[PDB]
DNA sequence: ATTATGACGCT
DNA sequence: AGCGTCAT
């Protein structure tokens, strides 16, 4: 009972862009803005591949992974944007500069972890701290929370969206206990407000628009941002985890996507995340391991304890290029020069990184995919990092892997090479 | 013939 | 160190 620790010690929020890169190229082409639009790497197979999609081609069906001439059978008036190609490759430079835009922004309201390209937990419990001496047990307006969902709500005793949302925000806001400064539903209250405003401050500098979630730790806050995207911000209390999980499949959950959520699935015979409440602890690690035992064991009942990182930056930096089919790389002369196209961008990006962080990778990790190997890396080896040099780099990492041909021709490539992938890594400041 | 990344756990 | 998992 009371000393049953509830994992209500911190306000966490995840921010993530909505359609980011399909955003970017919207800002830049105005023709593209409110439309059904999507972003796609190459051209020539099949209209190229889909890695972004506008909400207007959402509402067809167009999504991530298909291809570009299949999407327009769906959304015959479909617009396309794009990736930049550079030296034989698709080049990401654009998006990641706006990504970097987002992120110093963010970074004004507390320290922040970038967990991938366009979205980036926060830590807010100190800020909110902050706020609610400033508030001086004043309640708070709803007016404060614009774009604000409280999950779960309204309840009991109607027909717009809008109308809804302000329902349950109602309800929420008439619930408050706001003398007490350590309530934990004030504290996420206060939260949203400095989330709204931080969403504000990155559409108002950069157009850009994002979704949130905001709850006690970091699984939660995610899961928060997804339930009402585009444009709007969801705040998950601890309160709302019963009945919001008892209908939640395994998989919706980050990291239980993959065969360990299918194990847990198959071996327990359940199929929610609300069903794990009823084995314990032990039973759990038995089937599942120590560690992802103990973290099912908390999740399931809203506690997590993984922390925000305090880091902004990437801690690698890479590149990589498939070769499918019959492009696959079947002589040293074709291997040696992606190679070394991909060592070009990689000493640009990285020259670029120690001009503006003060630091300079120290290991290089080469790796490949053979034909017939359905693994993401057939093979990984790491060399010394000494010199941002392409052509030294690139030797280099011919060194490392020219073993793996294992035809006896000194000029053919045997089995043939379906990709490569250079990653700088363990930085230190410069 | 999804592709280009990036984080992190295991041994 | 090199490999596997998860994400997307
Ligand atoms: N190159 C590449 N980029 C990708 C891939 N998948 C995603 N991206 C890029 C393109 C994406 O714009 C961006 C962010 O990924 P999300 O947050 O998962 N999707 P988004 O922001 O588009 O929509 P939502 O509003 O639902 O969050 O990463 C991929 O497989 N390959
Ligand atoms: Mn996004
Ligand atoms: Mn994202």
């Not at 999950?151 to 349950?168: A, D, F, N, S």
């Not at 400095?194 to 559409?203: H, K, P, Q």
């Not at 640009?348 to 890396?377: C, F, P």
């Amino acid at each position: 009972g009371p000393h049953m620790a509830t994992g209500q010690d911190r306000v966490v929020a995840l921010v993530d862009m909505d359609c980011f890169f399909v955003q970017v190229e919207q800002r830049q082409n105005p023709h593209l803005r409110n439309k059904p639009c999507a972003v796609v790497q190459y051209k020539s197979w099949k209209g190229g591949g889909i890695i972004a999609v506008s909400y207007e081609a959402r509402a067809f069906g167009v999504t991530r992974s298909m291809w570009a001439d299949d999407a327009k059978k769906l959304c015959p008036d479909l617009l396309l944007a794009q990736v930049r190609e550079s030296r034989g490759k698709a080049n990401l430079t654009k998006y990641r500069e706006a990504s970097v835009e987002v992120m110093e922004i963010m970074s004004r309201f507390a320290v922040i972890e970038r967990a991938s390209i366009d979205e980036a937990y926060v830590d807010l419990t100190s800020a909110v701290q902050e706020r609610l001496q400033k508030l001086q047990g004043q309640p708070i307006s709803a007016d404060l929370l614009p774009s604000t969902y409280i999950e779960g709500l309204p309840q009991g005793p109607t027909v717009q969206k809008e109308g809804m949302r302000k329902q349950g925000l109602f309800q929420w806001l008439d619930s408050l206990q706001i003398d007490n400064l350590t309530s934990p539903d004030l504290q996420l209250t206060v939260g949203a407000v400095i989330v709204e405003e931080m969403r504000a401050a990155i559409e108002r500098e950069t157009g850009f628009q994002c979704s949130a979630g905001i709850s006690h730790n970091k699984v939660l806050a995610k899961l928060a941002c997804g339930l009402n995207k585009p444009n709007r911000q969801t705040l998950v209390s601890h309160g709302s985890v019963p009945q919001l999980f008892s209908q939640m499949p395994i998989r919706k959950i980050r990291s239980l996507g993959g065969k360990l959520g299918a194990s847990v699935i198959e071996i327990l015979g359940i199929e929610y995340m609300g069903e794990l409440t009823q084995f314990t602890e032990s039973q759990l690690q038995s089937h599942f391991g120590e560690k992802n035992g103990s973290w099912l064991y908390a999740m399931c009942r809203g506690i997590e304890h993984d922390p925000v990182k305090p880091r902004q930056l990437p801690k690698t930096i890479g590149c990589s290029k498939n070769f499918p089919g019959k492009t696959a790389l079947a002589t040293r002369e074709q291997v040696q020069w992606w190679l070394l196209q991909l060592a070009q961008e990689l000493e640009e990006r990285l020259t670029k990184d120690r001009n503006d962080n003060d630091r300079v990778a120290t290991q290089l990790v080469v790796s490949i995919r053979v034909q017939g190997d359905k693994r993401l890396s057939s093979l990984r080896r790491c060399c010394a990092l000494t010199r941002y040099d392409a052509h030294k780099m690139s030797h280099d990492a011919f060194t490392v892997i020219k073993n793996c041909n294992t035809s006896g021709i000194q000029t053919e490539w045997s089995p043939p090479l379906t990709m490569l992938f250079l990653c700088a890594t363990k930085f230190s400041a410069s």
